[PDB]
Amino acid sequence: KSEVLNTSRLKEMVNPGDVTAQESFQMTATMVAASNYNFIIDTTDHGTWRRLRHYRSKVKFCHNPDPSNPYEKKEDPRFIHEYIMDPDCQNAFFSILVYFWEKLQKEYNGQIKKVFCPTIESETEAYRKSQDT
């Protein structure tokens, strides 16, 4: 279902500092969240809502395609049932990732905040206009 995201635990999963277990260790991991339903955010401090990014998918994958609508296409469940276990696909994907990382390093000098995207930080601020009861 939809879930509520507690403002707690956010700082220590977003911060680059050491976090304890109580064993302490430095944590470095790119974090991603996706759901079919919406989240609940109740905060307005600039400390939060600034290390957050939001996007919304527009396309829809379904068996019976609807013509004249670019936001829908026929789905290929095979992409899920198989195409993961193939070594060749994983090799190609790994090559794509390393190429993209090298491109980022040579362009923006390893800085993700320097990169430019108009839709991002525009949809995100619109989401920030929500979640304020």
Binding site: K1, S2, Y37, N38
Partner: protein, 99 residues
């Protein structure tokens, strides 16, 4: 939820207000408790399937940028409208392709 809409909401002729938006989930909670089972619900997301339901054509907008209803009546209890085959002996034979 579709059954609840059919039971508690029928097309009102006229002289009916928008009932705001929380009335639908408020009535649906008690209807679900008294019909299927008792359990809590979160009203925020329950609104979306209302647009996903048949009430899409009748979910009007409001000057306060809220969702209101039209052509609706809050019914209750007993209120009226108020206007292939079989093979010879071997099914394990699998038959031809249609089977």
């Amino acid at each position: 939820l579709h059954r609840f809409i059919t039971e508690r909401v029928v097309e009102s002729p006229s002289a009916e207000t928008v009932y705001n938006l929380s009335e639908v989930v408020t009535a649906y909670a008690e209807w679900y408790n008294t019909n299927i089972n008792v359990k809590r619900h979160i009203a925020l997301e329950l609104s979306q399937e209302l647009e996903n339901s048949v009430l899409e054509k009748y979910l009007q907008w409001s000057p306060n940028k809220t969702r209101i209803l039209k052509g609706c009546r809050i019914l209750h209890k007993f209120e009226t409208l108020q206007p292939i085959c079989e093979p010879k002996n071997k099914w394990w034979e699998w038959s031809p392709n249609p089977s």
